[PDB]
C-alpha cells in the first residue's frame, strides 16, 4: 500500500517521504520534523492550491504517488 511523495522544503530542495494513502497530515508533518527539524506547529503545507490541515488525511486532497507538497514556515 505504501507510496512515495515529496516535500519541497524552505531551501527549494525536496525531501522524499514514504507514506500511506490515508495518512493524516499530522504524520506527514512529523516526518518533515524528523528530517528538517521544524516543529509541526511551525509548518504550513500546500498542495495544488490547498492548505493541508491537521486532522485531515492525504486522501482528502487527492495526494497520489510522486506528489510534491510545498512547505511554508510559520
Angle made by CA atoms 10, 8, 16, in degrees to the nearest 5: 125
- Give the start-to-end residue ranges of the domains of the chain: 1-74
Name the residue among 33, 55, 36, 52 with its Cα closest to residue 44.
52
C-alpha cell at 7: 516535500
Between CA 9 and CA 2 the distance in angstroms is 22
* Cell matching residue 49: 492550491
| Cross-strand bridge partners of residue 70 | 8, 46
Alpha carbon 72 to its chain's center: 11
Resolution of the experimental model in angstroms, please?
2.2
Nine cell digits for residue 63: 495526494
Helix (H/G/I), strand (E/B), else coil: 17 = strand
Experimental method for this entry? Answer: X-ray
DSSP string, 37-69: ---GGGEEEEETTEEE-TT-BGGGGT--TT-EE
Q: What angle do CA 30, 31, 36 make, to 5 degrees?
A: 100
Residues 6+ positions from 13 with CB-CB distance below 8 Å: none
CATH architecture of the region 1-74: Roll (3.10)
Amino acid at each position: 500500500n505504501a507510496m512515495q511523495i515529496f516535500v519541497k522544503t524552505l531551501t527549494g530542495k525536496t525531501i522524499t517521504l514514504e507514506v500511506e494513502p490515508n495518512d493524516s497530515i499530522d504524520a506527514i508533518k512529523a516526518k518533515i520534523q524528523e528530517k528538517e527539524g521544524i516543529p509541526p506547529d511551525q509548518q504550513r503545507l500546500i498542495f495544488a492550491g490547498k492548505q493541508l490541515e491537521e486532522g485531515k488525511t492525504l486522501s482528502d486532497y487527492n495526494i497520489q504517488k510522486e506528489s510534491t507538497l510545498h512547505l511554508v514556515l510559520r
